[PDB]
């Protein structure tokens, strides 16, 4: 039984970030990883997605070429070219991350970890045992898929994992779900030329975002050529002569349900959520608490119910974002190895960007959330809607919507929501201001930057 | 003699903004304008410039087309197409601004105003007299040009005003100066295909910006195909058979001076500063104080030396930016018509973006300024340099540089400087945080947005 100061299960964002900070603090740490370092972010998430987004962004801009005085650009996108360059870039990152571990003197134990029956918390990887007074579980999650028992043929569809394996642009694609991945992938497939349908259970995407965003985002998708199938769900899938055939039921409220077949589908993409990866950990041998989805339960300090065992990142099922896993893993290293007992991540006011077209940025409370928290009489919003000056000369148009949610008499800024060109890079600094407790006067007292889209946020009336 | 509550001389950014806020407060105001409403910003500045920048941005992106899996875009930019659409857009804005005035019940007196000999401050426009207990001078400035006495043939060159009149892309262009307009125009002309030279008196552009910026910006220009002629200045210009011929003297320190002729020049652009427009105002009839460049002298409240006469914007020669003229004009309306005696614009921490390629954003003190203000022992900077993920797949590359200047033990953020893709829309929110007095801990305690360029500012170490 090899002993360490810190044992980290999972070499993804949260696991790596925690291990590296702990090692800086003098801990002798090892990282157990059964696949590729970098985990979801590097291999099948953030990184490869953003590359594909930049590619779709090129497609849109190229529609505006002639309006801008250039000669029309003629045609066919070649999926394989960018796919190969994307994969290579991912290979570069894996090599970098591995080097980051070695330079920090962190040991990398390759293989699949599982807890043992042993009294003191101990894991087994490939026959060998390892132990530590502090063990971090940061095993992430996986894409959720329907059971064949509920949706026969569900297994003919792919997930975001399978999207990253595609070698050619699918001719006809159908995306199921109404959250981040659905919106992102539909926007990428569509811009690149796939005839795309987005199938959602209600009438709008991103129903947990401020209602201004869910409305605007749904419209922007339609305006971009994405067919949004409202109030619809898959009843069954089957492999026909040439592609898949999707049976769906559409149940608009106030109407009779109607069954439709979608034929000749090349790609069926399930974008219905993620499940925690705790199934094969043998948690129950230590009696570690999980919810009924398999998530590990933790307190505000990332403690599990068992002493000396912690969990961070997607496996805990809260705020499933790379930078959250990293921040939580780092605060945890400071608490453990620098004895900062108050060291923990504040889960309020975490900013997030949805890489749609145009992109969405949001931080803090939606209008309804602030209304519930402070009361209607105490909530004031400001908003604007305009067409970016970029489109002053184009036939194609997109809009920019911004909303500021303020609370109390002081008009404390409790939420910012926006969609528009440039919104991916605009959010970070406002998120700093919101975190510091800015009021509307603080915004208003900042001189604007002209001509930009960002200046609108500081001149709301 | 028609009397008003407020008389505004000049219908540009500062003048319009002040008049409109005063009218909201109940003032009976009139705006005197001798040319087009919207002044410099709308007609020959901010707006038409940004349209041309977006156009150059299209040119660059189109170089990356093939790398992104698309087929190569072939060619020739057509200046006249975008020029016509730009002019139309400017026509739209003029009509909008005029409507904004009318809806506010502001009178527009068309013509050129000049002060009279009259005791109580009174102006004359086209034979008629007008007076008010509060008169605002917001007449802006003009491009500065060399005298034929110092540089013979200087008058064969154009200014930024003349740039906006060009109907075709000049084949060969030479830009003189090393400030905002020089950098902007060189970057636009070059991206659009003109064979461009930038002639600067020293070795770097933007020598008043943080030294990291001036260095990086000079290199980015060279990497983009702009020929930077260091330690050089124009000795004379002459009209040859086919274009202009520029005589220059190059005096590298530690070297003998050398004279060079630049032949076949299509466009010679003077970008050497601006002069205030006070010459024809008859200021001296009231004894209003000006500096030796003709700028009007004002106090912290925009007061001139004469009671009931104020000045804002470019004519005062300080912080020559649209949003500064607007903010100063507005604070001034609140002081005058809402009796807010403490109402004034803080000239510290005004953010500014230079529309270069890539764009520059800066707010607060440069490293040297903070060193002078707090002392070397009390100044700490953090910086980063990286290649944006956008270029992970391109043969063409640009860099992103960021520097944070902190002061004292608390590490108060006193300056932010950056250049890179997205930096035009990224600055605004950090400028809010800087204005509020954020410290580095405030930045560091804000969860990042991944994957973006902006996240780098909150993870500096
Ligand atoms: C398509 C997609 C796009 C996304 N885009 C973004 C975005 O733009 N921005 C953003 O902020 N977030 C984004 N996310 C979410 C973000 O990727 C995740 O929140 C983040 O990767 C979660 O990190 P983690 O450390 O919890 O887990 P992961 O990164 O999943 O790491 C878990 C690791 O543990 C390993 N492992 C699991 N079990 C074991 C075991 N028993 N033994 C050994 N090793 C094991 C796994 O192989 C894996 O490498 C995206 C996600 C997806 C799926
Ligand atoms: C090429 C260029 C690009 C720029 N780009 C930017 C940028 O991107 N962002 C930015 O923030 N700033 C930019 N600036 C600077 C910005 O345009 C100026 O700071 C701003 O316009 C100054 O406003 P003002 O109200 O002082 O004057 P102006 O807008 O010049 O208004 C003065 C007005 O007074 C009128 N006038 C003058 N004398 C009289 C008289 N006697 N009687 C009647 N009317 C009179 C003039 O016709 C004019 O309309 C740019 C400037 C230029 C030249
Ligand atoms: N840009 C970024 O930061 C990105 C972050 N991520 C992270 O990864 C997480 C996982 O993303 P994703 O998988 O999109 O999950 P989400 O939970 O974001 O989205 C799924 C949505 O699909 C709908 N849905 C649920 N079950 C079904 C079903 N059986 N059939 C049809 N629709 C269904 C629901 O919306 P409704 O109730 O309206 O039907 C549900 O909320 C994200 O939430 C985010 O935390 C992922 C991608 C990008
Ligand atoms: N994006 C934005 O916000 C923009 C804002 N503006 C505003 O308008 C102002 C006017 O812009 P611009 O006209 O560029 O003025 P600036 O004062 O910005 O730049 C001029 C520079 O050229 C050099 N120079 C001065 N005299 C000469 C000469 N005789 N020969 C050669 N070079 C000379 C000097 O630099 P050195 O000492 O190194 O030689 C000088 O500082 C700006 O400063 C800014 O306030 C303008 C454009 C864009």
Residue B305 sits in the same domain as residue B177: no
Within 192-251 of B, beta carbons closer than 8 Å to A belong to: none
Q: Which contacts of A300-306 are long-range, i.e. CB under 8 A and separated by 24 or more positions?
A: A300/A344, A301/A332, A301/A335, A301/A343, A301/A344, A302/A328, A302/A332, A302/A344, A304/A137, A306/A121
Residue B19 sits in the same domain as residue B117: yes
Within 324-353 of B, beta carbons closer than 8 Å to A belong to: 324, 326-327, 345-346, 349-353
Question: CA-to-CA distance for A417 and A423, rounded, in angstroms?
Answer: 10
Cα of B274 from ligand 4 centre, angstroms: 8
Q: Is B323 in the pocket of ligand 2 (CB under 6 A)?
A: yes
Map tokens 């804000």 to a residue.
Answer: B446
Query: Taking a C-beta distance cutoff of 8 angstroms, is the pair B296, B288 a contact?
Result: yes
Q: Checking phi first, is residue A173 left (phi over 0); if not, alpha (psi -120 to 50) or beta?
A: beta
Half-sphere exposure of A54 (CA within 13 A, CB side): 26
Angle at A390 (CA atoms; ends A385, A395), nearest 5 degrees = 90
Q: Is B351 in the pocket of ligand 2 (CB under 6 A)?
A: no
**Is B296 annotated as belonging to a binding site?**
no
Residue A163 sits in the same domain as residue A220: yes
Question: CA-to-CA distance for B9 and A18, rounded, in angstroms?
Answer: 62
Question: What residues form DSSP beta bridges with B240?
Answer: B243
Residue A226 sits in the same domain as residue A297: no
Copy the structure tokens of residue B29. Answer: 């105001």
**Is B322 annotated as belonging to a binding site?**
yes
Copy the structure tokens of residue B294. Answer: 């003709």
Element (H, E) at B270: strand B267-270
Copy the structure tokens of residue A441. Answer: 């006067």
Question: CA-to-CA distance for A384 and A213, rounded, in angstroms?
Answer: 12
Helix axes B423-435, A423-435, angle to 10 degrees: 10
Please state, as a whole number, how many other Cβ atoms lie within 10 Å of the Cβ of residue B372. 12
Element (H, E) at B55: helix B46-63
Closest by Cα among A206, A57, A441 to B435: A441
Exposure string for B260-280, b = 16+ CB within 10 A, e = fewer: eebeebbbbbbbbebbbbbee
Closest by Cα among A3, A90, A2, A8 to A311: A8
Query: Taking a C-beta distance cutoff of 8 angstroms, is the pair A257, A395 a contact?
Result: no
Map tokens 């009336």 to a residue.
Answer: A461
Question: CA-to-CA distance for A67 and B86, rounded, in angstroms?
Answer: 11
The method recorded for this entry reads X-ray
Determine the 3-state secondary structure of B362 from DSSP.
strand
Count of domains in chain A?
3
DSSP B272-339: S-EEES-TTS-GGGTT--B-TTSPBP--TT-B-SSTTEEE-GGGG-SS--HHHHHHHHHHHHHHHHS-
Domain limits at B284?
Answer: 1-143+273-348
DSSP strand pairing (A2-3 vs A128-131): parallel
Determine the 3-state secondary structure of B240 from DSSP.
strand
Ligand 4 atom nearest to B201, measured from its CA: 39
- What's the CATH number where A195 sits? 3.50.50.60
Please state, as a whole number, how many other Cβ atoms lie within 10 Å of the Cβ of residue A103. 10
DSSP strand pairing (B172-176 vs B267-270): parallel
Query: Taking a C-beta distance cutoff of 8 angstroms, is the pair B308, B133 a contact?
Result: yes
Closest residue in A to B61 (Cα) is A58
Map tokens 């591995």 to a residue.
Answer: A98
Residues 6+ apart with CB under 8 A from A241: none
Copy the structure tokens of residue B251. Answer: 């005096």
Positions of A marked active-site: 450
Closest by Cα among A143, A134, A379 to A274: A143
Work out the burial of residue A244: count CB atoms within 10 Å of its CB; fewer than 13 is exposed, 13-18 middle, 19 or more buried: buried
Within 87-116 of A, beta carbons closer than 8 Å to B belong to: 89
User: Torsion over CA of A18, A20, A22 and A28, rounded to 10 degrees?
Assistant: 120
Copy the structure tokens of residue A159. Answer: 């997930």
Angle at B251 (CA atoms; ends B181, B233), nearest 5 degrees = 35
Question: CA-to-CA distance for B183 and B217, rounded, in angstroms?
Answer: 9
Copy the structure tokens of residue A397. Answer: 């148009």
Question: CA-to-CA distance for A278 and A137, rounded, in angstroms?
Answer: 9
Closest by Cα among B262, B232, B229, B257 to B247: B262
CA Rg value for chain A: 24
Domain end (from B241, B272, B303):
B272
Question: What residues form DSSP beta bridges with A168?
Answer: none
Question: CA-to-CA distance for A412 and A405, rounded, in angstroms?
Answer: 8
**Is B330 annotated as belonging to a binding site?**
yes
Question: CA-to-CA distance for A415 and B151, rounded, in angstroms?
Answer: 57
Residue B134 sits in the same domain as residue B86: yes
DSSP code of residue B149: T
Residue B79 sits in the same domain as residue B65: yes
Closest by Cα among B421, B397, B394, B399 to B68: B394
Please state, as a whole number, how many other Cβ atoms lie within 10 Å of the Cβ of residue A289. 12
Work out the burial of residue B186: count CB atoms within 10 Å of its CB; fewer than 13 is exposed, 13-18 middle, 19 or more buried: buried
Whether residue A65 lies within 8 A of chain B, CB to CB, comes out as: yes
Which residue from A58, A85, A393 is facing B51, i.e. has the nearest CB? A393
Residues in chain A: 461
Residue B16 sits in the same domain as residue B139: yes
In angstroms, how far is CA A58 from the centroid of its own chain?
22
C-alpha pair distances (Å), B251 with each of B141, B247, B261: 32, 13, 14
Copy the structure tokens of residue A39. Answer: 């985990």
Query: Taking a C-beta distance cutoff of 8 angstroms, is the pair B40, B97 a contact?
Result: no
Query: Taking a C-beta distance cutoff of 8 angstroms, is the pair A190, A225 a contact?
Result: yes
Rounded to a whole number of angstroms, the distance between the first and last alpha carbons of chain B is 66
Residue B433 sits in the same domain as residue B402: yes
Query: Taking a C-beta distance cutoff of 8 angstroms, is the pair A217, A183 a contact?
Result: yes
User: Torsion over CA of A157, A159, A165 and A171, rounded to 10 degrees?
Assistant: 50
Question: CA-to-CA distance for A460 and A383, rounded, in angstroms?
Answer: 7
C-alpha pair distances (Å), B94 with each of A82, A148, A213, B3: 45, 63, 32, 27
Query: Taking a C-beta distance cutoff of 8 angstroms, is the pair A459, B431 a contact?
Result: no
Q: What is the 3-state secondary structure (H, E, C) of chain A?
A: CEECCEEEECCCHHHHHHHHHHHHCCCCEEEEECCCCCHHHHHHCHHHHHHHHHHHHHHHHHHCCCCCCCCCCCCCCCHHHHHHHHHHHHHHHHHHHHHHHHHHCCEEEECCCEECCCCCCEEEECCEEEECCEEEECCCEEECCCCCCCCCCHHHCECHHHHCCCCCCCCEEEEECCCHHHHHHHHHHHHCCCEEEEECCCCCCCCCCCHHHHHHHHHHHHHCCCEEECCEEEEEEEEECCEEEEEEEECCCCCCCEEEEEEEECEEEECCCEEECCCCCCHHHCCCCECCCCCECCCCCCECCCCCEEECHHHHCCCCCHHHHHHHHHHHHHHHHCCCCCCCCCCCCCCEEECCCCCEEEEECCHHHHHHHHCHHHEEEEEEEECCHHHHHCCCCCCEEEEEEEECCCCEEEEEEEECCCHHHHHHHHHHHHHCCCEHHHHHCCCCCCCCCHHHHHCCC
Residue B356 sits in the same domain as residue B289: no
Q: How many helices (H) and strands (E) does chain B have?
A: 11, 23
- What's the CATH number where A415 sits? 3.30.390.30
Question: CA-to-CA distance for B118 and B209, rounded, in angstroms?
Answer: 45
Query: Taking a C-beta distance cutoff of 8 angstroms, is the pair A268, A157 a contact?
Result: yes
CA Rg value for chain B: 24
Residues in chain B: 461
Q: What is the resolution of this structure in A?
A: 1.9
C-alpha pair distances (Å), B181 with each of A74, B3, B186, B272, B353: 35, 40, 8, 8, 12
Question: CA-to-CA distance for B336 and A136, rounded, in angstroms?
Answer: 63
The alpha carbon dihedral of A277, A281, A283, A288 has a sign of negative
Query: Taking a C-beta distance cutoff of 8 angstroms, is the pair A408, A418 a contact?
Result: no
Question: CA-to-CA distance for B1 and B128, rounded, in angstroms?
Answer: 7
Residue A139 sits in the same domain as residue A278: yes
Question: CA-to-CA distance for B172 and B190, rounded, in angstroms?
Answer: 10
Question: CA-to-CA distance for A311 and A324, rounded, in angstroms?
Answer: 13
Query: Taking a C-beta distance cutoff of 8 angstroms, is the pair B68, B60 a contact?
Result: no
Work out the burial of residue B449: count CB atoms within 10 Å of its CB; fewer than 13 is exposed, 13-18 middle, 19 or more buried: buried
The alpha carbon dihedral of B314, B319, B322, B325 has a sign of negative
Which residue from B59, B78, B426 is facing A428, i.e. has the nearest CB? B426
DSSP code of residue B439: B
Closest residue in B to A328 (Cα) is B447
C-alpha pair distances (Å), A155 with each of A40, A170, A185, A443, B272: 22, 17, 19, 51, 68
Domain end (from A223, A256, A272):
A272
Closest by Cα among A422, A421, A460, A423 to A442: A460
The alpha carbon dihedral of B324, B325, B330, B331 has a sign of positive
Residue B248 sits in the same domain as residue B290: no
Residues 6+ apart with CB under 8 A from B289: B296, B297, B304, B305
Contact B438 A443 (CB under 8 A): no
Domain end (from B302, B330, B348):
B348
Determine the 3-state secondary structure of B342 from DSSP.
coil
Determine the 3-state secondary structure of B56 from DSSP.
helix
Query: Taking a C-beta distance cutoff of 8 angstroms, is the pair A326, A305 a contact?
Result: no
Question: CA-to-CA distance for B313 and B262, rounded, in angstroms?
Answer: 38
Work out the burial of residue B332: count CB atoms within 10 Å of its CB; fewer than 13 is exposed, 13-18 middle, 19 or more buried: buried
- Beta carbon pairs, A and B, within 8 Å: 254
Cα of A433 from ligand 2 centre, angstroms: 31
Residue B179 sits in the same domain as residue B55: no
Which residue from A79, A327, A447 is facing B351, i.e. has the nearest CB? A447
Copy the structure tokens of residue A16. Answer: 């790596």
Nearest CA to ligand 1 atom 48: A39
C-alpha pair distances (Å), A230 with each of A17, A176, A186, A257: 41, 11, 15, 12
* Alpha helices, H only, B155-253: 160-163, 180-191, 211-223
Closest by Cα among A93, A210, A315, A108 to B451: A93
Query: Taking a C-beta distance cutoff of 8 angstroms, is the pair B186, B196 a contact?
Result: yes
């Amino acid at each position: 039984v090899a002993s360490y100061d810190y044992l980290v299960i999972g070499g993804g964002s949260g696991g790596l970030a925690s291990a590296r900070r702990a090692a800086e603090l003098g801990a002798r740490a090892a990282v157990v990883e059964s696949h590729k370092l970098g985990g979801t972010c590097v291999n099948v998430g953030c990184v490869p997605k953003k590359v594909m987004w930049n590619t779709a962004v090129h497609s849109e801009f190229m529609h505006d070429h002639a309006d801008y005085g250039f000669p029309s650009c003629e045609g066919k996108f070649n999926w394989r070219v960018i796919k190969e360059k994307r994969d290579a870039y991912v290979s570069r990152l894996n090599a970098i991350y591995q080097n980051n571990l070695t330079k920090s003197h962190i040991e990398i134990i390759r293989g699949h970890a599982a807890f043992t029956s042993d009294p003191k918390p101990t894991i087994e990887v490939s026959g060998k045992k390892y132990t530590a007074p502090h063990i971090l579980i940061a095993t992430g999650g996986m894409p959720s898929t329907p059971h064949e028992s509920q949706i026969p043929g569900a297994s003919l569809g792919i997930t975001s994992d399978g999207f990253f394996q595609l070698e050619e642009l699918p001719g006809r694609s159908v995306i199921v779900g109404a959250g981040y991945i659905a919106v992102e992938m539909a926007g990428i497939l569509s811009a690149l030329g796939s005839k795309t349908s987005l199938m959602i259970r209600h009438d709008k995407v991103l129903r947990s975002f401020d209602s201004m965003i869910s409305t605007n985002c749904t419209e922007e998708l339609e305006n971009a050529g994405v067919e949004v199938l409202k109030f619809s769900q898959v009843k069954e899938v089957k492999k026909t002569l040439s592609g898949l055939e999707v049976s769906m039921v559409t149940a608009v409220p106030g109407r009779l349900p109607v069954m439709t077949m979608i034929p000749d589908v090349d790609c069926l993409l399930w974008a219905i959520g993620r499940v925690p990866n705790t199934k094969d950990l043998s948690l129950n041998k230590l009696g570690i608490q999980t919810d009924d989805k398999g998530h590990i339960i933790v307190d505000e300090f990332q403690n599990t119910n068992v002493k000396g065992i912690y969990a961070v990142g997607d496996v805990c099922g809260k705020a499933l974002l790379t930078p959250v896993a990293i921040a939580a893993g780092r605060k945890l290293a400071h608490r453990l190895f620098e004895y900062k007992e108050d060291s923990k991540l504040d889960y309020n006011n975490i900013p997030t960007v949805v890489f749609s077209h145009p992109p969405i940025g949001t931080v803090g409370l939606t209008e309804d959330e602030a209304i519930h928290k402070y009361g209607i009489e105490n909530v004031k919003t400001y908003s604007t809607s305009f067409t970016p000056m970029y489109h002053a000369v184009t036939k194609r148009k997109t809009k920019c919507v911004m909303k500021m949610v303020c609370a109390n008499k002081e008009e404390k800024v409790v939420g910012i929501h926006m969609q528009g060109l440039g919104c991916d890079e605009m959010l970070q600094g406002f998120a700093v201001a919101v975190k510091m407790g800015a009021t509307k006067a603080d915004f208003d007292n900042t001189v604007a930057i002209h001509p930009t889209s960002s200046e609108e946020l500081v001149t709301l009336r």
